[model samples]
Target: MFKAVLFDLDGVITDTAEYHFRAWKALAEEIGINGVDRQFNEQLKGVSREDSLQKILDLADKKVSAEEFKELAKRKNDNYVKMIQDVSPADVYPGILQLLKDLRSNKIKIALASASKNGPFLLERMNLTGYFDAIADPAEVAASKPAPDIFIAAAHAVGVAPSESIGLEDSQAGIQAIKDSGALPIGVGRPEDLGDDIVIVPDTSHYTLEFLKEVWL
Candidate 1:
């Protein structure tokens, strides 16, 4: 049986991807980059803020001074923070809160292993902070998703062995991290996109405790 469940914040627990996309869209437009659509936003998933900004710059084929890059990244994050200010428990996915509740009732530890620095604040704002036994700090991880550091740290925080835990993620990088960490990867997205090695849920709305047990556990 899985002893713990590690979740990615944005696409797994909530729909903050829209807010992220909107913030990035606005910032990209302000910087004279056109066609910043959902397709482009997909590239930013499971990546750090700095890496996302760098991807945006690469998309625009532009370069900036280190100071300028920092400033723009800060501006984008400020916009994102403002956008998520009104988030509440209702913003959580349909079955997510119940799933967390069920996990707790089952004596399963839960941890968050997000790339976002604002993950703790976002969880608090959404009233979901209490569900997590541990929350990984991005700063504490040596590298982001596809590196396994964050997931490894998160499992450790929850006092679970990586091989005994499961990680829910929605991006290729996140799936890679979970796999590399020796945990089961429950992917939330298209099967083709997430790959065949992991269990794919299609989307968060379909993710439930029962579904997980039936297909994964």
Candidate 2:
């Protein structure tokens, strides 16, 4: 039933969540904002960079000028990008390759829906560049997750109606975005942390071609 599969890049595709948290933590510490613990990172999942930074500052009872926030956010990206250079194919979760290959073999159009603008480079680094038919990133969308822009763009790029596509996401905002886009949403991680109408998997290794075919096809 699903003609297209829209995948989230960070937690859904690769294990980059930890790197993101580390980058944010480093930046928070530099600003004397030490309240950004792992629990905070978990709570802040799916929030935009500026919003997350603001929340961190608020938690630390600190404030920054808009320009200062922008500069600090850029620094976080710089650090995260540097940390991501160490990611390799081995860092990709198990069964992802098989799932992608299976979906491709079935002639299902593949689209990437990510908040990250660095998605293309990361895909290339992960040897996953050729697998997707199109990518819809934050660079192309004015609004990030919890907005339908990215999912809508991804579905449109694949020439499929949103109703004909399925979105695989790992966070609350991502699920909300897919819902707003009118697509079937599958939650890849903690369902309790997100919304309903989502399929939860403990990890990518638990995902199999048969499972997708049975549930989505």
Candidate 3:
């Protein structure tokens, strides 16, 4: 039996990806880096702000001084924070809150393992901060997703062994992180994107505690 459930913030728990995309795109265009679209935005998912900015810079073939990069990243994050100021409980994905409630009732610990530095702030904004037993601090991780640091740290935070936990993620990098951490990786998007090594749920709308028990437990 899984002793804990680890969730990713943007796509798994809520739909803040749109806000992030808009913020990044706006920043990109403002800096004369054009061609940022949904497909390009997908590359930023489950990644740290610094890495995301680097990816955008690479795509635009643009180079910035260290100070410029820092300034640009801060500007992008400021825009994103401003965009999410109106977030509420209604922004949470359908069934996710109920799943959290069910996990609590079952005595299963819940942890958030997100790449976003604003994970806690976003949770509070959405009125969902009470759901998680632990929220991983990005500052504590040496590396971001695909490195296993965040998920491993989160598992430790929740007092659960990696093997005894299940990680729910919507991005390939996140699944790789969960797998490397020795946890069961549950993908939240297309199977083709996540591959055959783990179970995939098309979307959070169909995700329920009972469904997870039946499929993974």
Candidate 4:
């Protein structure tokens, strides 16, 4: 049916991870959260909502106050929110605009299936929000990336069977998430790193509607 297409935010659209990395780095430094280094931010990725705080606490002891927890989160959030303004159309992957237009023109549905709480915000910041029919909330789903539920939830939001759709992803977990959702997973980066036997493109700039439909077929 070529029903719909789901997309991952971090690599597929534009990378918001680096901004989060920078924010977390600054936040930790301000607290003298000792064990963190430039590369320690990878620990921040894919962690639960409070896990980052817990990690920081582990590095330096802290028993959080309910109000204080929210305040610290906002402080970190504020750093990233201000940095998100750096996103412009130029930040989008080369062929992403064309791909979105191609799907819209062809009457195919589109949805965002990100594990990011900032999915809507990022899309809006990139000026791509209008292109998506729905943005599945991670909060609404029981599981996140690598669990497949997020992709399923995304397809649900777009009113499509997971088997009838395509999801574009860059990370290993993302590809697995799409695969297990019963949707076709198109790897947008190195196939070797993404996993064996998945249809892949070297990058999003090469993603063409014809190529995608051929993959779908």
Candidate 5:
């Protein structure tokens, strides 16, 4: 039985990807970086801003110093933050809160592992900071998703072994990370792209704390 639930914040708890994509596209265009296509967005899902920005820079055949990367990352963050200024608890996914409550009621610890550095801020903005037992943001990890560092760290933080946890993710890269960490993966929204190792759920609206308890346990 899974003793802990590890979650990804963006698409799992909130729909923040549209804002991220918009900000990234805007930043890329401003910097004259071409080829920030759908393929790029697809690859960017479940990755940290630094890693994603580096990939974009590489695709544009541009390399920058660490300081430059930091500057650009800040710029992108500024844009993203501005775009999400109107977001609030009302904007969060419908069933996410109930799911968290259910997990807590079942005595299952819940940890958040998001590649986004803004994870905690977003959680607070949505009035959900109290729901998570621990949050492992990309800034806290040496490597991001598809590398297993964040998930492993999250499990450790929640005091659970990887095999004793279940990961809830909405991106293929995240599913891969959970798989790498030896956790069972439950995917929300278009999880089919990640293949069979991930169990597919239609979306957050269809998920409840009881559902998670029943499925994960």
Candidate 6:
């Protein structure tokens, strides 16, 4: 039923969140904010690097000069990017790879609406760059997830209207963006905190077209 499919690169296709969490945790500890555990890492999800670092700083009531803030955010990203260097095609979840192939075979247009500026880099690392016809650069979008800019741009670049497309995302903010873009939203992870009345699958293993087709109806 959909003319195009929009994908979120991070959790939807790969597990880069682990890298982000580890980088952020280490950075927090280095700055004397101990106990930056998984529980606290949830706040970093789908947010900008500056926002995540500021959130950590706010937690400990720590303040830094604007120069220092920029430096710290870049430091975290540098570390995160280093960890992502080893992300080859093997990092791509099997089910997501299968879904990509299925979409291609079905002639469904594929586009990326990822918040990560490294979206194209990660896709290239996974050997999945060719799978996407258009990738909406987060840098080019007016606003990030939950604002619908990236999704809207992605759908436009793919030559499809938002209403004629479906977006798969693992983050609540991304889900909200998809919904606001007027496209069908498919939650790629558990829907516990993703608000009710949304279609969802446990993970990429269940991200099959057969199930998605049912939702499309």
Tens digits of lDDT, candidate 4, 1-76: 5789998887788877667777777877787776666446545554534566677767677677888888888898
The residue-by-residue lDDT of candidate 5 on 1-217, one tens digit each, is 6888888988888889767877888878888997777667767788778878988898889978989889999999998988777779998898888878888888888998888778888888999999889987567777888889999999999899999998888887898899999988888876446566557888887777666657776
lDDT score, residue 61, model 2? Answer: 83
In order of appearance, the predictions have TM-scores of 0.94, 0.92, 0.95, 0.80, 0.91, 0.93
Please state the error at residue 82 of candidate 6 in Å.
1.0
Tens-digit lDDT string for candidate 6 (117-182): 788889999999988889988888767767899899999998999999999887777888899999
- Report, for every candidate in turn, its global Cα lDDT versus the true structure: 0.88, 0.83, 0.88, 0.80, 0.83, 0.86
For 9-69, candidate 3 gives per-residue lDDT tens digits of: 9889988877888899999999998878977776777888899999999997899999999
- Kindly provide the TM-score of model 2 when superposed on the true structure, using C-alpha atoms: 0.92
Error of 1 at 208 (Å): 1.9
Which 10 consecutive residues of model 2 have the lowest summed lDDT? 189-198
Clashes by residue pair, model 2: none
RMSD of 3: 1.4
The root-mean-square deviation over C-alpha atoms between each candidate and the true structure, in angstroms, is 1.4, 1.7, 1.4, 3.2, 1.9, 1.5
Off by over 4 Å in 3: none
Judged by lDDT relative to the true structure, which candidate is superior, 3 or 4? Answer: 3
Model 6: per-residue Cα lDDT at residue 64: 91
Candidate 5 vs candidate 6: the TM-score winner is: 6
- Judging by TM-score, tell me the better candidate of 1 and 2: 1
- Model 1 stretches astray by more than 4 angstroms: none
Question: How well does candidate 6 score on lDDT at residue 51?
Answer: 71
